[PDB]
């Protein structure tokens, strides 16, 4: 049945591994359990005599499998039942020969692909790079030996260690997914698959996978997600073993990883579940191996020794002491000898042994220990921190409101200094906050800050799972597993228990009425609140009302109070990190009072941070904000609710073990529970705690008389203690003063965090003069330290759970390959690695598919070549162009796809039939609505992605029962038709502009409805509800299921297998933007009528320029050919790219790229774009007023004066490693025309070619390197069109608008 082929079972692990789920399907089948589960608390307590008398398909498969496995193992001995991770070394080396043959079928075809196409992939990479680096380099053009080993071994993916088990686990994974899908539909088919591997049998069901070994008479059982975990880890460590062995600066890691894997697997058999404590230490060794390379002897070798002592101290509790010695010696040998980058690389080994099995009991003990614990804080240190808290609020409100203090209760200003500073309304310095802390801690405030409860609205449209109330709490568990007296208490879920849905069905939702759940203390009257804790290793299940007040308080702190503390958000979390690490001693060592400043760094480890807060410590800090908002009791709700409530750890398969647990107010502080949780919950109330920690960091900076540039997101505190030194001072004095200041500050920071109740450790934290850690990225000496091998472990072979989607699965691989090229790998390696992996992807989906056609085109090898190499805009699968390797996706996509097809034809990869069939392709549907909603595009015939279809369907289903007073004008009866009519009005003119019409409709209220609809949380459990309450249909769902087939056949029909005798007038030797404009015009021609769709295309940055490195004599053969329009790129000679930074030219931060309601800004954006596009006359202003009238409530005489200038206004992932891009000089003088979009890309192209000159095996430079990117002799130099103004023919649509909504309208006339 087709209903059960949409929400597919997932292919990769995105869930915790629960132990007692697996033990339920172990006890439910007939097998004997392991020895470490004999006295278990859930196994001994349940009434299995009723549980085994249901005879659902959930149990009968397990009964037949318990009969089936038991036959191929004898009765002569005892059957050992090894439980994960004690079975890691076996399943690590699993060898099914069947799946090995089934993948070597694919291997043979990939070897055919290399034998047919390897030399044109050589010709491409040796022609494009030759073109961009000129004929002064055409004797220095040799391919990298990452590409060459990829070329001689095409089957890299098949001929490594771990491959023979990677085959096996991918095969068992796809079989179990197919068995789940086939078990969805009610049937009585063969629900069992037996495979045969070297010494034993493998049993596959919807739930379990059971692997047996017959010579040792053992067997292991795996739950549904545990085979996902093994399947992820095998291709993870095998792809690590591929990348770290074919890359020249990484081959020395290849043994060092293959040791440390195969070592710790051997430690799995006896350590067991505790071996992940050894896995959790593997990060600290990669830190300490960077810390071994300090400039001075201090701080070098401290944390490496600490982790080595901790590794010994954990192994000696379990091992013989000789084995702990030998193992510790081995670990210390592996992590020594490594460079800076090669010790950043060993952070890949984190997920590479998998995840420990979880349970509610042992994860509730670790919360009762540190949350129901007594504390004793210092009141006189609370006052010293609260001094800086109130002082920072005073200075933030002063700087925000033009030099005015907040509304102080004026009878509470004590002392002659603070009354003086109020009377002047000046800025408190930190010294006065330290000295006068008794006077400044007691200052009060009045209601001077007016909040806004629903500020963001994206955080209310999240799908956060909501606990059902405490009279129904046993509905959190499987009703199969509750006992009979506890089955009497579960009621039915009328709600969906989602914050996404129950917010939209919320009749009578007023924000200010709902904050009175807190300020009036009714939330603590409320005897229905139950909180539920998650199984993890940050999330909790609250009730509805309490979660709403949680999100509101987060929003109010996040917008009003938190930016007072400087906020220490995409590039501002890496400009304020890369320039912060310019403050190390080694970044500025050419030069080596008040002329230079340097820093040293502390990245700290606070023990159990979020749950060591108490009401006693945060009450006064909350009090200073309840006063500043005019609120009686708002921001201390967390501790006062958790003191009076009892919460538990939430897992279905982990019920309470005692069968006499009915009510939460009677359970003991025991098995799964926490009674009177004094501490916080991670993630919740994060803003207030971050602000208290900033106040404490600044307090300790003042108590040792130093300056600190901290950054903290919780307990991820990174402190840069600075010191300003002389240019003519000795280096030993500099590195002495820094270490003295670091010791003083660290001592005081220990001291001020100890007295508020927070252990930051002396040894666990990482002090260094050189590097620091932020979001698991190590910043060291003004560069970011490489993470290629973390990204290689995420390189996988299925991406998506909504259909058998090959297009999104090739897009995932394309992005991860581009990410490896950013971390520093060659271009020719990564592009051809993308080609080979998209080949493996498209053959992997033909076989192994869990939806049983494709046999026509799947053996056509030049079709599969031309399919994963043609860009996805033109129809194929290659999202990764050759240009995306050099720069970022700014610019027009269509010209780039045609430039790639022009290059692929010019070298001989892609056939000359295929470009001409693109140029002769029949058009698609074509809409004014679609061309407005998606410019840059083509009107080729295409099928819609199941992600887009199902997301849009869920957005339309959830806003059906939308009944809250807020966001009431979001879903109307004709919100489609206004978009259609507005697109028809904007677009159909004398000169069609798609981009500016996209800008206008995005600015008007139609795009506002789109933007607010696009904030809902489309998880899969939301898509399941929106399909179970309004089904997708018959034709759309058949387009969902057969999406990859229809896409592949559509590329085959339209552009590959096609004749197209009426070839057009456009040639193939022209500039590609001509062909993109021809294809846009011819494609939209049944809709446009013949008018030029213009104002879209940009040049391709690679195609435009013909670069040239200068020779020795100076002056280029391109600039001696009669050309002076170029860009000047200079690189100074003799740059050591390593620790010895003595004589480097000045390293700088490299090139990266009011006071109104934003409705008014969107309105003025609409007016500006409309007037600059269609001319400036009062007929245009008549409609532009009507469009801006939709958002705001101003009149025509304000728009003509408030209209901005006619403009171009229509960590996580760093853009690269920065090695020579901090040392390169840019001069855009001679390109007299393009001094916008073109030069922003030409700069990044030049700075990517410069660092593409030097690999990761080169630490020095030897010449000055100059580039002249000449572009006057180019085919793509075309004159900008003459803007001939006209008048918008017709009248704008009515654009009806509700005035009640603050999210969509601004009634105040500005």
């Amino acid at each position: 049945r087709a209903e059960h082929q949409i929400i597919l079972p997932e292919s990769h692990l995105s869930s915790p591994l629960v132990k007692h789920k697996l033990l339920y399907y172990w006890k439910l089948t007939g097998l004997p359990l392991p020895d470490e589960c004999d006295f278990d608390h859930l196994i001994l307590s349940r009434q299995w005599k009723k549980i085994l008398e249901s005879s659902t398909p959930d149990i009968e498969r397990m009964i037949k499998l318990g009969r089936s496995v038991h036959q191929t193992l004898s009765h002569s001995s005892k059957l050992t039942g090894i439980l994960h991770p004690r079975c890691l070394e076996d399943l690590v080396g699993l060898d099914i020969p069947d799946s090995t043959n089934k993948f070597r079928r694919i291997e043979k075809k990939i070897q055919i692909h290399n034998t047919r196409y390897g030399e044109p992939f050589t010709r491409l990479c040796s022609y494009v790079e030759k073109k961009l680096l000129g004929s002064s380099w055409t004797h220095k053009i040799r391919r990298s030996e990452e590409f060459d080993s990829l070329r001689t071994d095409p089957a890299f993916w098949f001929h490594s260690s771990w491959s023979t088990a990677k085959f096996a686990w991918l095969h068992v994974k796809q079989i179990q997914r197919h068995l789940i899908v086939a078990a969805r539909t009610r049937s009585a088919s063969n629900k069992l698959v037996t495979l045969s591997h070297r010494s034993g049998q493998v049993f596959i069901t919807p739930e379990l996978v059971i692997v047996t070994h017959t010579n040792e008479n053992k067997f292991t059982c795996l739950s549904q997600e545990l085979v996902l975990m093994y399947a992820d880890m095998m291709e993870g460590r095998d792809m690590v073993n591929i990348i770290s062995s074919t890359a020249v600066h990484l081959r020395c890691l290849a043994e060092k990883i293959d040791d440390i894997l195969r070592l710790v697997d051997a430690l799995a058999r006896d350590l067991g579940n505790q071996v992940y404590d050894v896995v959790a230490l593997m990060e600290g060794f990669a830190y300490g191996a960077v810390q071994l390379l300090e400039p001075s002897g201090t701080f070098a070798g401290d944390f490496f020794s600490f982790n080595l002592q901790e590794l010994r101290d954990t192994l000696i509790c379990l091992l013989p002491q000789r084995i702990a010695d030998s193992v510790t010696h081995a670990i210390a040998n592996i992590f020594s000898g490594l460079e800076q980058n090669q010790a950043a690389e060993m952070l890949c080994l984190l997920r590479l042994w998998g995840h420990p099995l979880l349970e509610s009991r042992a994860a509730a003990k670790a919360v009762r220990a540190q949350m129901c614990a007594p504390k004793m804080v210092d009141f006189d240190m609370i006052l010293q921190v609260l001094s800086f808290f109130k002082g920072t609020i005073i200075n933030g409100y002063r700087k925000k409101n033009a030099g005015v203090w907040p509304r102080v209760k004026a009878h509470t200003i004590y002392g002659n200094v603070i009354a003086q500073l109020h009377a002047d309304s000046a800025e408190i310095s930190h010294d006065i906050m330290l000295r006068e802390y008794k006077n400044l801690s007691a200052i009060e405030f009045e209601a001077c800050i007016e909040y806004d409860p629903v500020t963001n609205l994206s955080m209310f449209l999240k799908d956060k799972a909501i606990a059902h109330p405490r009279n129904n709490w046993l509905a959190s568990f499987r009703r199969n597993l509750l006992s009979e007296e506890q089955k009497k208490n579960v009621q039915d879920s009328t709600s969906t228990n989602r914050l996404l849905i129950e917010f939209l069905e919320s009749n009578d939702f007023d924000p200010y009425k709902e904050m009175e759940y807190l300020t009036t203390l009714e939330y603590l009257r409320d005897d229905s609140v139950a909180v539920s804790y998650s199984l993890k290793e940050i999330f909790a299940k609250l009730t509805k009302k309490l979660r709403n007040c949680q999100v509101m308080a987060e929003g109010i702190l996040a917008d009003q109070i938190a930016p007072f503390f400087q906020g220490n958000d995409s590039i501002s979390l890496t400009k304020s990190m890369l320039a912060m690490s310019q403050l190390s001693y080694n970044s500025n060592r050419k030069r080596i009072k008040h002329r230079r400043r340097v820093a040293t760094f502390i990245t700290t480890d606070l023990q159990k941070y979020c749950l060591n807060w108490r009401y006693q410590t945060i009450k006064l800090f909350a009090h200073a904000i309840n006063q500043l908002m005019g609120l009686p009791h708002f921001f201390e709700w967390i501790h006062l609710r958790l003191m009076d409530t009892t919460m538990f750890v939430g897992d279905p398969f982990n019920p309470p073990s005692d069968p006499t647990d009915y009510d939460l107010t009677k359970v003991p502080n025991d098995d799964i529970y926490i009674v009177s949780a004094r501490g916080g919950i991670e993630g919740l109330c994060q803003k207030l705690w971050t602000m208290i920690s900033i106040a404490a960091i600044q307090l300790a900076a003042a108590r040792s008389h130093c300056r600190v540039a901290c950054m903290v997101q919780g307990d991820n505190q990174v402190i840069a203690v600075t010191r300003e030194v002389r240019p003519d001072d000795s280096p030993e004095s500099v590195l002495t003063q820094l270490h003295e200041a670091s010791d003083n500050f660290f001592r005081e920071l220990i001291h001020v965090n100890h007295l508020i109740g927070h252990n930051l450790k002396d040894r666990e934290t990482i002090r260094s003069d050189t590097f620091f850690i932020y979001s698991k990225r190590i910043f060291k000496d003004g560069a970011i330290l490489s993470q290629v091998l973390k990204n290689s472990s995420k390189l996988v072979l299925v991406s998506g759970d909504l259909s058998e989607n090959t297009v999104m699965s090739c897009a995932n691989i394309s992005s991860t390959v581009a990410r490896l090229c950013e971390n520093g790998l060659p271009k020719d390696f990564c592009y051809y690695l993308n080609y080979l992996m998209s080949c493996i992807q498209t053959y992997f989906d033909s076989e192994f598919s869990i939806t049983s056609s494709n046999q026509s085109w799947i053996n056509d090898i030049p079709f599969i070549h031309s399919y994963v190499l043609t860009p996805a805009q033109l129809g194929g699968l290659s999202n990764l162009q050759y240009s995306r390797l050099y720069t970022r996706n700014i610019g027009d996509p269509g010209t780039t796809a045609f430039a790639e097809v022009k290059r692929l034809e010019a070298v001989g990869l892609l056939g000359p039939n295929i470009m001409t069939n693109i140029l002769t392709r029949p058009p698609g549907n074509g809409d004014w609505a679609s061309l407005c909603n998606d410019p840059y595009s083509f009107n080729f015939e295409s099928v819609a992605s199941p992600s887009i279809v199902l997301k849009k369907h869920t957005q339309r289903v959830l806003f059906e029962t939308c009944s809250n007073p807020l966001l009431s004008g979001v879903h109307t009866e004709d919100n489609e038709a206004e978009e259609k009519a507005l697109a028809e009005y904007l677009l159909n003119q004398e000169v069609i502009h798609p981009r500016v019409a996209h800008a206008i409709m995005e600015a008007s209220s139609v795009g506002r409805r789109k933007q607010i609809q696009g904030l809902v949380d489309t998880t899969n459990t939301v898509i399941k509800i929106a399909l179970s309450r309004k089904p997708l249909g018959i034709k759309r769902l058949a387009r969902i299921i057969n999406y990859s087939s229809m896409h592949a056949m559509l590329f085959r029909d339209d552009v590959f297998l096609s004749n197209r005798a009426n070839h057009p007038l456009v040639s193939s030797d022209m500039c590609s933007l001509a062909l993109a404009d021809y294809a846009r015009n011819r494609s939209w021609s049944p809709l446009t009528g013949g008018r030029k769709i213009l104002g879209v295309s940009n040049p391709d940055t690679i195609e435009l320029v013909e670069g040239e490195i200068l020779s020795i004599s100076g002056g280029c053969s391109k600039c001696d050919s009669g050309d002076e329009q170029f860009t000047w790129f200079h690189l100074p000679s003799n740059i050591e790219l390593t620790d010895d930074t003595s004589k480097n030219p000045p390293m700088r931060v490299p090139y990266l790229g009011a006071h109104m309601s934003p409705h008014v800004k969107a309105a003025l954006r609409a007016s500006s774009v409309l007037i600059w596009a269609y001319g400036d006359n009062d007929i245009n202003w008549t409609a532009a007023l009507k469009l801006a009238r939709s958002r705001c409530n101003i009149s025509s005489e304000y728009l003509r004066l408030l209209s901005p200038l006619p403009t171009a206004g229509n960590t996580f992932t760093p853009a690269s490693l920065y090695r020579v891009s901090p040392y390169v000089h840019i001069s855009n003088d001679s390109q007299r025309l393009f001094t916008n979009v073109v030069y922003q890309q030409i700069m990044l192209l030049g700075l990517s070619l410069i660092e593409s000159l030097f690999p990761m095996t080169v630490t020095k430079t030897y010449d000055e390197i100059t580039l002249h990117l000449h572009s006057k002799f180019s085919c793509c130099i075309r004159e900008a069109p003459v803007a001939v103004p006209f008048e918008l023919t017709g009248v704008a649509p009515d654009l009806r608008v509700v005035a009640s909504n603050k999210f969509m309208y601004d009634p105040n006339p500005v």
Binding site: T412, A442, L620, N626
Partner: protein, 71 residues
């Protein structure tokens, strides 16, 4: 007779209005800083009262001095 009592009078009046008036502004400023060091006693006791969850309805818009005088 009148001149001797007159000069004894002015000697007594002169030196004692030297030293009493010398003594007064000193003790005046000390009773001043007793005020601003006794006000923060009530302020810190109002801070200490509201940390206990037995007093959570003591709404924050009130005065910490007034919570010291709350009883």
């Amino acid at each position: 007779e009148a001149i001797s009592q007159r000069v004894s009078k002015i000697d007594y009046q002169l030196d004692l209005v030297l030293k009493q008036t010398s003594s007064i502004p000193t003790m005046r400023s000390e009773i001043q800083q007793l005020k601003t060091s006794v006000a923060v006693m009530e302020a810190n006791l109002g801070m200490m009262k509201i940390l206990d969850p037995g007093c959570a309805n003591v709404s924050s818009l009130s005065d910490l001095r007034a919570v010291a005088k709350s009883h």
